[PDB]
A = this chain, B = another copy of it.
């Protein structure tokens, strides 16, 4: 009967562990799925990053283009102001 209580505890105990195994399997499933979604999102973000960098680069190139045009303008304006002074003296 000692082994009588035992046999009962084992029964309830093995049931507990099976219930716990069931819960673990649900949680592990949802965990793996969350990791997959994560990885999918990271891959999307990388591809995007690639495109974003390209955009940044294009914009930056255009920017250097404008600054070069601005410098030229200022070189011309320097010459222009000189010639303007020279014209004004004639008067």
Contacts and interface: CB of A to CB of B under 8 A. Distances in A.
Interface of A: 3, 6-7, 9-10, 13-14, 16-17, 20-21, 23-24, 27-28, 30-31, 34-35, 37-38, 41-42, 44-45, 48-49, 51-52, 55-56, 58-59, 62-63, 65-66, 69-70, 72-73, 76-77, 79-80, 83-84, 86-87, 90
A59 B34 contact: yes
B20 A38 contact: no
Contact of A13 (B21, B31, B83): B83
Residue from A6, A10, A34, A37 with most neighbouring chain B CB atoms (10 Å): A34
Contact of A31 (B16, B30, B59, B87): B59
